[PDB]
Symmetry: D2
Subunit: 377 residues, 4 copies
């Protein structure tokens, strides 16, 4: 039961996705390249500043709107959904919450209209162990020198803004981790070739290297040493976003597959009429239902200002795990055609597999959930 | 708002039941299980606390609360004793609802004040040859003057040992199949009605479960509940609601089991660590917690859909299937997390395990839930 | 494919179980009491000395014969099976392997004819962490004083011999653990009342208290400080025994249930003809087949003198887990009648649940398998 | 003796294929996957190593080895590349077996020497309207003098791009249903036979999978393989063995993936620990190891049952179902254990994952395997 605005935004995104994205899904996947038409369409439609204030060109909508947009996009293409998720839930939120009036006035208008941001936390030696990051920041008078590397950076290929976590004092561990706003065009910053991936292929995923990258002191986001707090704070909200992506992906796969099994006839009946298959369908539908409830409930808790971290982890864990199961089963229900790239279900399957890995792997979600359970008893 | 946000009345009712269960039920749980016998004090308490007429209008002695209140009461009772919870669920969700929905004004005035104050009802559908296939029931009702004569048998009748009222589904015209099935309000002490000995069961042992036989049982024509030949409709309609009620029971028992077990694994030490600090065990606990959360949301959402007058049958089936399946998994894992002590009757987790197993069988076995969900999915595409 | 002797032993055990045990299963379960007639029959049939040399009244059979016997008994009553498994795989084996010729001459003739043995490792503070056992043994000239308590001792109510693990020097930790042959009627040895259990109810499970229990130095089994090794060695073999018990229990439950679902009619069909149910049955059958192959292969690896520990753990883990799944499903396939004590499937379900707990709980089995996988690469 | 105790010849053949696969196949696996194109060198190499006539008698240029040897060759190949394994599986367990078991002495003398040395065969059963329902195939064979004229189409034909021989199931009398189905030996260069474009696939990409069409394809009556109208029996007979072959492929690919992943999780450090030392991950690994072990035993036992002339169809279905299902779970878990690198094509685990998914679909989808298993269980009680 959504507000009028939430319902309108959902219907608008559904139309946009069907008309502007669906025709391109296959070719974007094949060539690991999101089309400019889609990217600029997202900005044009106000989908890159959903919660940002209108004064900065934002839509001014609710967090649940962002969730419904992510879900609705992912029903067509999970790659476009995460592209939208990163901008809204990681980049925009961090700048909204911790930016100075100066930083907000500068960056938010660009971020709602044409500039793409990348969230730069992970390194080769700091994946699940994010706070072991070795990218360092040395204060030299009016600027900081950044040295290190990042790995797996989503949207980096054409990003203009990099939100970079770097340690200003490695002798104090994670409490030296600080957030920096870094412009693309700066000596020493290199964005490498996008990875060649199993799925999520249209979402660029690039290595970064920082060779004596110089960042003005005014480009520190928030307080020195609090960057670890901002990283995991934004990722707590990001887990709801990834729950929504995984949900939408799984739903889109399911929605496509049921009409097929209704129409396909073997042994004189609809595939849907074999009870073994009906039971698998019903089991999966129940899991999709549970996933949707967990995702929306986490979102509503966040909106209400209630504790939501355990619930966000629960949604991301469950939705990502059941998206793997849903997509795997849909290929089977389709049979042979499901194994071919002429049908969409094999892409949903390839895309879903990422969900149990990024924004905190499944084991990490369970660790977080257990910590919360320990504190409740 | 979040699914766990309740009205003031819902919150107050939940709180009262928690207190009542802990004070009046918990000390008797073990004895009742051991002896397969519900205590009169507990039955009296349920009535005295208003828990047998939760949604019934205050004009008939009821509390006039929401359906979600009934769900919360069942859950809360089941955290302490699943057998007491089903006793409450049958009265509210099957018996009272059938009469509230399909009774004449005279029938409501006559039966509801008794059902809210002292009289227990039994729902009588199933037979030896008609379990999942309920509408193959062979109990027949033959019209003689202004009465019907009932002949046949029923099986698996819960609360029969104490019930004053039996809501009996019987066929008035077996040649038209299910469309002959009719609901009858049969009083306990009607000549020809025999209540057999209670089953010796794995769990839910304090809830009496008895066979019935009908030998020329005379029932006035006025004692038909609703329209002749619509008994099948009324039975399954009430069971659609009862499925949310069984979801609530399964949820509550799984939660009670889990809540008991976590403090133990935090306290118990092996290899110098709390059991809770073994990551394998932690992951299992977190996975189970997630399933409990999903089961809760499914159950409450089904209840809210029902309250909003929205379609709820698929969702009720989803809640019952899911809650019952994860109640089995939850209780099975809790025994393991407890270790050896979990396998003994000196601890409560083995009873929760035995009790949970019924949830995938009664009020429509799991396969039947899946068949129902599939029918709705086919209609949606 | 088995040897002529293995086939003959299996066939005679099947007969003995159906004629002498089956009629008593319900009552033994209801009363939590093993019948003396059943115990006498086990000894009389040569089932309590399966691999013991004929010198000592044994049957002189193979280890796989012991596995087949435990499986066949468990098809009728898991409680009777474990009684047999403890005697053969834990007690007899330890005395055969580590006994002096005088100890063998004394105890093995008794253990094959009338005397029941109990294996005494676990304590309240030492279950999974067995080697944290606090029962101590002090040498006082020609004897050892044992002080402490044990928990969960199977067969204790009837046992004339207790094989006890006690620590002779706790500063050395587990390397002080030593094994002692203790006669029932020794002062200071108190056997508590049997546990009131969920299942395996006919197998007595008692606490023991050792208040200054004096064991002659002649009654040390093996070398001092090597008791930890004997304990876990016998338990490696015991794990194959419990796999066989769990296999038999699950197979007996399955074998009972299939005729019912073929005979029972709903909606004008045999229950067996509903495809959802068929698929569940076929899935369980596949797991039963896999559990059997794991159990027998582990047994053959032991007999061939090949490494078998990883394989024994895999068998016990898998067979116990699928015994729980099989019995849970069988109740569902039977419907209402499966939930009543008038039918046998609810007992199989209560009995199966102990399989993932005793003889090293599932998590411990997985830790062991992981240690071996670690060593293979 | 344990199921992993082989004959000296079986051990020798396993070792030989391991060496061949590592030296001749491993370097090319990524290119073949990327290009969807099997390399000529690999196919030539399979023939040269004697891997395309494993069980064929030496009088026809075969090795005359055991069926378990074929299983071990398939397993060992799939550890490196499941596409190459299926290429070998079809030739040995479908094509060579059909002709060995049901060919005349003349057909054996003509075809087996070709098939053991240079000629690839395709097995042509499935159609767009006849997948799981194979025997609903509509390809017709009409008698015209001493010849049969084939008309229709096939779908999903593996190895078609390279095949010189097509074993085609066609119905000579559609009015008698499945009893009209007949196997035909059809040369690639027969007029009227057209091989369509290879499918663009999720995995198994180096194995060509093509549609066929038959326009008045004239076959001499001597080219019927076996008895007219028994082609349904021959086809499903060969598929019962092929199910053990696919079990072996799924087993080998899962094992290869597993074997690659364990050293990685031993060496990768996070939070100061090897990934292998996180107990949650350890338990997942141990669980997967147990499943692999169980799949191996099911696979080898089914093979040994077949060799002993014992009933093996239920066991073959159990092996294929179980191995395919756990290959999916194994490869899915390996990607997770690897983390980010597992999701990239620079590492080999994502290909195992994509390849494994075909296992639950071809050679009789999982549901069909369960149906077959159930039919045998019914006969046993
Ligand atoms: C396509 C893609 C896009 C991404 N997007 C971004 C991005 O935009 N910005 C960014 O900063 N990062 C991004 N990530 C990085 C992502 O968050 C990491 O891949 C993830 O955190 C896991 O790190 P890892 O790959 O180093 O795996 P590892 O940390 O090496 O984990 C491997 C396995 O070890 C297990 N494991 C690790 N630690 C524990 C533990 N303590 N307990 C139990 N199990 C454990 C994990 O659960 C996992 O199963 C992206 C990654 C990918 C693949
Ligand atoms: C303790 C207890 C209390 C009960 N309470 C009551 C009560 O108060 N009043 C009352 O009327 N009944 C009551 N029931 C009856 C209960 O609802 C039935 O046991 C249940 O509906 C199953 O019927 P059955 O036992 O005959 O099993 P069956 O119908 O024989 O089912 C056996 C198995 O077959 C499967 N199956 C059956 N049909 C299909 C199908 N079409 N497709 C796929 N699978 C199928 C089922 O899912 C199940 O797994 C109670 C039962 C018990 C055990
Ligand atoms: C009926 C019965 C009969 C028995 N028979 C005998 C007998 O004859 N003789 C005898 O000596 N003993 C016997 N046992 C004892 C049995 O072996 C123990 O109950 C078992 O080893 C577990 O010990 P615990 O009960 O203290 O549970 P705990 O050790 O407290 O374990 C509880 C849970 O914690 C988990 N856990 C513990 N350690 C770890 C770890 N390192 N990593 C991950 N998870 C962990 C366990 O897997 C389990 O899930 C019997 C027990 C029973 C119930
Ligand atoms: C890469 C590839 C290679 C192949 N190789 C060959 C080859 O060389 N030669 C050849 O002839 N064929 C080959 N096959 C065809 C393959 O065997 C079929 O795809 C398979 O039998 C499934 O048929 P289908 O694709 O039409 O799916 P369908 O028959 O439409 O099945 C779709 C789904 O419906 C379910 N279903 C169908 N019937 C039932 C039932 N009765 N009960 C319960 N569930 C049911 C299935 O289990 C599956 O989940 C190949 C296929 C592929 C994709
Ligand atoms: C967050 C992280 C890195 C912390 O692990 P670890 O180093 O073991 O953390 P801890 O020792 O428990 O705590 C360190 C600090 O983090 C905080 N913290 C840890 N998890 C948190 C969470 N989920 N939410 C908020 N704070 C958290 C702790 O409160 C502590 O801060 P303070 O000293 O100010 O109280 C880990 O749990 C995690 O989530 N890793 C995956 C990160 C991720 O999602 N990456 C994906 C990037 S986009 S694909
Ligand atoms: C309800 C029942 C018996 C019907 O099975 P079946 O005979 O296959 O039903 P159908 O042939 O699909 O339809 C029969 C009638 O019931 C209706 N119906 C079936 N399921 C229904 C449901 N869940 N809700 C409402 N109506 C339902 C049908 O619409 C039809 O009525 P109409 O002719 O008025 O449209 C079966 O689905 C079921 O739920 N069985 C278990 C019953 C149960 O829960 N027993 C427990 C008692 S307490 S333990
Ligand atoms: C065996 C036990 C107690 C060891 O605990 P743990 O902390 O892992 O011990 P470790 O540090 O691994 O090693 C201690 C010694 O035991 C040995 N050991 C451990 N597990 C072993 C096994 N499965 N087989 C053989 N030896 C084993 C080690 O080799 C070491 O001996 P050495 O010092 O001579 O090399 C534990 O893994 C276990 O299995 N617990 C359950 C015990 C059980 O089955 N109880 C049931 C009784 S009847 S229900
Ligand atoms: C075999 C097949 C096609 C037919 O199923 P179905 O319609 O239920 O067949 P049935 O009615 O049970 O029996 C039809 C005939 O086939 C026989 N048969 C069926 N399954 C058999 C099996 N597994 N082994 C041997 N014979 C079998 C029957 O005995 C009967 O022949 P007879 O009249 O001589 O006794 C189906 O079960 C199957 O296996 N489908 C998948 C086919 C496959 O593997 N395709 C892959 C090609 S390569 S990817
Ligand atoms: Cl803003
Ligand atoms: Cl991108
Ligand atoms: Cl009312
Ligand atoms: Cl009662
Ligand atoms: Cl789930
Ligand atoms: Cl001996
Ligand atoms: Cl005993
Ligand atoms: Cl399994
Ligand atoms: Cl030959
Ligand atoms: Cl090819």
């Amino acid at each position: 039961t959504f507000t009028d605005e939430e319902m309108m935004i959902k219907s608008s995104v559904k139309k946009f996705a069907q008309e502007q994205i669906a025709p391109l899904v296959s070719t974007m996947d094949e060539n690991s390249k999101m089309e400019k038409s889609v990217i600029q369409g997202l900005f044009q439609q106000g989908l890159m500043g959903i919660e940002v204030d209108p004064e900065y060109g934002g839509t001014g909508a609710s967090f649940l709107s962002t969730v419904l947009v992510i879900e609705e996009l992912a029903k067509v293409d999970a790659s476009v959904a995460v592209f939208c998720e990163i901008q809204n839930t990681l980049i925009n939120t961090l700048i909204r919450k911790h930016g100075t009036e100066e930083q907000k006035a500068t960056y938010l208008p660009q971020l709602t209209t044409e500039k793409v941001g990348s969230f730069c936390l992970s390194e080769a030696g700091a994946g699940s162990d994010s706070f072991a990051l070795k990218t360092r920041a040395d204060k030299e008078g009016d600027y900081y020198v950044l040295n290190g590397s990042k790995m797996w950076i989503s949207s980096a290929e054409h990003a203009g803004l990099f939100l970079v976590m770097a340690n200003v004092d490695p002798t104090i561990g994670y409490k030296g981790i600080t957030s920096f706003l870094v412009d693309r065009d700066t000596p020493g910053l290199h964005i490498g070739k996008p990875e060649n991936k199993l799925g999520l292929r249209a979402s660029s995923t690039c290595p970064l290297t920082f060779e004596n990258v110089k960042v003005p002191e005014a480009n520190i986001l928030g307080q020195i040493g609090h960057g670890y707090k901002y990283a995991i704070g934004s990722l707590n909200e990001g887990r709801i976003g990834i729950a929504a992506q995984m949900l939408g992906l799984a739903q889109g796969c399911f929605d496509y597959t049921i009409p097929y099994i209704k129409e396909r006839i073997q042994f004189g009946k609809r595939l849907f009429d074999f009870q073994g298959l009906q039971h698998q369908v019903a089991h999966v539908a129940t899991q999709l239902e549970a996933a949707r409830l967990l995702t929306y409930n986490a979102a509503r808790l966040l909106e209400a200002g209630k504790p939501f971290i355990k619930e966000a982890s629960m949604a991301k864990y469950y939705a990502s795990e059941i998206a793997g199961q849903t997509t795997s089963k849909c290929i089977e229900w389709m049979g042979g055609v499901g194994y071919t790239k002429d049908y969409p279900v094999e892409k949903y399957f390839r895309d879903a597999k990422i969900g149990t890995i990024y924004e905190g792997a499944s084991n990490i979600q369970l660790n977080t959930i257990a910590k919360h359970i320990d504190a409740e008893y």
